[PDB]
Amino acid sequence: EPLELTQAFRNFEGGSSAWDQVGPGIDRTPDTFKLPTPKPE
Amino acid sequence: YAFAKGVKELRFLFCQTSQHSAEARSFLNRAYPIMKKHNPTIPILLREAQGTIPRVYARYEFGREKMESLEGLTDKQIEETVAKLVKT
Amino acid sequence: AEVELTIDGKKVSIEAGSALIQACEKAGVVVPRYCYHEKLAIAGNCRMCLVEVERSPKPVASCAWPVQAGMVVKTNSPLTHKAREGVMEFLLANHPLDCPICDQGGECDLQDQSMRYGADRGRFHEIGGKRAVEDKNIGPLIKTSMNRCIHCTRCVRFMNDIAGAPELGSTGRGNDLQIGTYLEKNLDSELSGNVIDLCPVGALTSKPYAFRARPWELKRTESIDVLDGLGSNIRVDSRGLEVMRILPRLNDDVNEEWINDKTRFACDGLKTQRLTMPLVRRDGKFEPATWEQALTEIAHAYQTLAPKENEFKVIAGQLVEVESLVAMKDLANRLGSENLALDFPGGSQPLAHGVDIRSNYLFNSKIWGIEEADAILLVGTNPRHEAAVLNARIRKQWLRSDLEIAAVGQPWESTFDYEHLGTDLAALKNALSGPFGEKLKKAKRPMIIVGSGVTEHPDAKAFYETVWSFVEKNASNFLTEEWCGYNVLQRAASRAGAFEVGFVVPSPEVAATKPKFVWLLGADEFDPADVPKDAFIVYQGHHGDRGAEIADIVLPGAAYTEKAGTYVNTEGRVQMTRAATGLPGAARTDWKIIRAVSEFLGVPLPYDDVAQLRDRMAEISPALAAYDVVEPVALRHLSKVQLVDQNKGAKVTGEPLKKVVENFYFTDVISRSSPTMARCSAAKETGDPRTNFMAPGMEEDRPMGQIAYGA
């Protein structure tokens, strides 16, 4: 039969934070897999 | 020279832009004053929207309606185009 | 010019004289805030936006720091981490442990920025305890819990600057500084409920909403307010069957994050006096009918009456949408009627402005045009009771610029200053011939605003030619390449859209034909002379009110929180609602009712779906297919014909202009059925500042309280 529900599923996903909680993190690439930097002068 | 008895409204759909030639705006610029003075009881709804192909509707009695495009017509050719609509 | 700085290592440009916090929202850099709001003056009080800046001994308030030539800003340094952690400790030290009993929980900036920027644990344990302050009575709408206040000053800035209500303030000093009114007095501002949303915390909350919902259990629907003519953008929060609250959402072109109290607090009238079943009048009583035995009873009556041309009459109300008017215009047209009336007084005769050129009846300078306006003339309108959030925009432009306002009509208590020039057309004629006309002439961006009350007046014929003649005389000021000085202000959501498709009486020949079959399409404020006693009355709508109680048959339609209907606001913006809930009981969609009866009456309408009708809509006016935008009137100068050429010899009576809004809280069926508006009116009648005035709660004279709300 087509699906009817005595009580519909309540999605509380709209209660998710308006503020970002994790940020960007950190870079952990080792120097051996980064490009070189042009030294001054 | 008013309309024929039976035309219940006129409805022109044109655009502000030159995408379609300025002839409908040129005809309406001149026509709408005199074409409203001779028969004030009839609505000539001038409706425009970006990218609207020029076009005119005449609504007749008991709900019937006639449409004719105005695309490519000139300010004179558009005049007879409306003229056949309100003359009978 | 846009100067160039680097924020968090990334380069950003922004106009000089901007706040550094503003340069952060451009650079995609999140900065915590409590006191700072984009729409308010900078206060500098919270200390949550402190960031690191070079050559600066101490952290700078980013909200109050002017962007300099080449500054370098760190929003993520040990200085900023230490400041945000320490300021959170201060704001949470005397804050009450009331997160379970508070209505701001799950939607709190203080808990979301405490979780993101403060320590996980408090160090405050004093045996002396926290600060406690007493609660306050500021009217029937705003429940107070002032222990929660963090002293951000957002509501005092809003009440004093935005709303022009200088009764709220902060009395005291030190840790005992307390927001409130000194005297226990009601807040009298139609923009009052906006402090509830501005409040970072739940000290200033909604009395009608108290304890009923949590934010995570709420469905969020982006819709349009229909309770006035502005089309304010709203967010409708529903929990299943029931709408819970109405929030504003951002539209800087329309409402600017504000809604008025009637838009906000009348939603509780969407559940109270609803129509859910067809009723046929039998022996002076209303009995339930099946939809079939109601449309058949309608069809039989129409067949018996045999209405000729224009003895079928249709009157449309404030809340009707365009899918109904375009469907009703097609039904009446094929029945032989062009008699398509409007609910206001004078809505059953040809209108002073016509409907041929859209610039005749619109707010032609946009709502955004007031942002530049230098001179504004008001003709017969109270901008507070007609367009409350548009009235605020006038005040905002007035405080920050040399804007001059004068008005013609009934004097009103105003949030801005203006000159009263008179009350009638003779006064208006001197107004333009006198100093304010020269002020209107000499100004850039001049602005005449005609209210819909004028269109209701005896002399709208004469008023509308007088104004337009001034405009045409004064183009290159009024009618420039980029400006339109002519505005007509609509106070009902349905009326510009009605004008858009011709739903208007065309001629007095039509208006002089007495009807015997009258459909009231959501019409409830109809004049008693526009409805014959012996006509067969059909009422379609969603509320049992003045329209339903005089009809022979009632048909339950949808409300605006349960339909996807197009509305055109006073400036010609085309907006669509979104259904927040389903239809109650056995109600139908209104355009389907009209399409359904076209079967029974003998003339079925071609479309069977909303897209087919919206294709019909877009060839009545193609602007109705361009949503969220306002189309420019190409032939602007053609407005002379219906405004002047058609309005030349008018039997002017000299009767002064009226005040078309007697009661702001009661303007339509939804408001007249709202318990919350019933409390707003009653408190305003007697001045009771008490929060539980006709609401649950204990009082001194009410030891035991009451379950009744609104009584």
Add this chain to the structure above:
Amino acid sequence: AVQPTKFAVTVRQSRNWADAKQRVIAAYRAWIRAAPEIQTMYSIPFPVSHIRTRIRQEFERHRYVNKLNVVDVLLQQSNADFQETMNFWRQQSHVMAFFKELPSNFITGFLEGRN
């Protein structure tokens, strides 16, 4: 490895439209050949003509497909549905769930509630 079951067919892509053309005919033939055998396996009380009618309609709904990669997903589903049916893994309720034994007008739909 483990043995593929009795009607297990390796999943392979159609080489060209001629390949797909011949496979679809092979699948339709194999279904209508098996309708007498489905009837007694599942104790269908209808006659086999109805069962073959339903097979025809299932194939007809994919009639107007002009994409090789959509046909091959479809040839996959029928292979698994055929293998599933012939090995008697599904039961009578599943096979009868496949036989159904919307309002026809706007006005009919309107009067009853939407449908």
Add this chain to the structure above:
Amino acid sequence: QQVALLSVGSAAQPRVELIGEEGTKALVAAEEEGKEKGVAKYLEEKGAE
């Protein structure tokens, strides 16, 4: 930028000096040559060594 790391080395083990200016223009080329031709093409023209 695996072709890049092969072209000029890495902050750990640089290949050539990249002294001051005129080394940056070589730095972008190492990344640009990686985006124009990949690893298989890179090993094709430098050969087997």
Add this chain to the structure above:
Amino acid sequence: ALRRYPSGEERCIACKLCEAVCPAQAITIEAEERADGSRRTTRYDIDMTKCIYCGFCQESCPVDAIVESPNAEYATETREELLYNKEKLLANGDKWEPELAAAIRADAPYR
């Protein structure tokens, strides 16, 4: 069981935290301001055939209102008997309070 303070006032204040944290959506709560202006529930239902008996709802309570009793013997003849309303849950607390208090006493320091 729903529990009361030593004065007979309900401890439940309608924060809805347990309704949010439920992993099986077995709790449905409706609240209002009571006649005396108190934040109290009007509806309080637990679908005892949806519950997973994890204790997360009593973990989250700010005021120790919702608790799980030490009672396991409550098997019923029908499933309607397993749809507990506020009337059934308060009655459970009113009957089981001496153990609910002795369990909280014995287990509180570890919470």
Add this chain to the structure above:
Amino acid sequence: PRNAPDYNVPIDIATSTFTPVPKNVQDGSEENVVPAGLISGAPMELQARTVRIYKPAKPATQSGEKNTQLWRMDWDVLGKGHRWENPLMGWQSSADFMQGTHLTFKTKEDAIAFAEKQGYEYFVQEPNERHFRPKAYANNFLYSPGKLKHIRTK
């Protein structure tokens, strides 16, 4: 014929009394669009129902803007069957199987591409953008040569 309700569309095991009449369904002949909804297994109701594609606006009650970052695709509420009250407990029943579902997309184009490929009807609204204006703390204290139009209170 100009977006018409097709009353001969076949029904399947998932059609109920709340299934809308469809204007059209995919058949796999359409150009450049993968007919995913034809082979997905979803009922035909998914092609009779319009979705809304939009960026959620910031809540009025908060200043955080993380729920405004992305594009959301929802299913519109139908007139019947979205909610009704259970006779037994007063719980809110439903016959709309899409009421608790939503999809999230990085760009508007991705949302259109997915809805086109699934056979959804779809309406897009564009986000209302903030009008920028410089804000200066020193405006609070500007000199007034004439009448003070309001008395600022901080």
Add this chain to the structure above:
Amino acid sequence: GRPASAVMQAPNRAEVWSRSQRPRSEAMAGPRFEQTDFDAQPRPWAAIELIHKQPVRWTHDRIVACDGGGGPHGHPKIYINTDKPEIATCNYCGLPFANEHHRKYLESLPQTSYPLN
């Protein structure tokens, strides 16, 4: 709805105490209640009547602390201002407080919400 155990909302209170509370007489009716023992049904006492039999805790301090008296067993600790000449109530448990500075005014009111003594 024959017995009083099927009409009175609670044994200690007959009428409803919320705007939305369905009356007992309107919920004990129907086919599901036709062979039912009404007094065997859960019929708990109304907390609204009970809390208001508590007497006022009098105090001289401006600000009182209530944590529910249970220590960790009670409720989150809060603070109630007692400055208005009115009985101040704890928002969690409803216990009444008054300040002695209003003792003369409160003992003059024709009625009150909590026993002053």
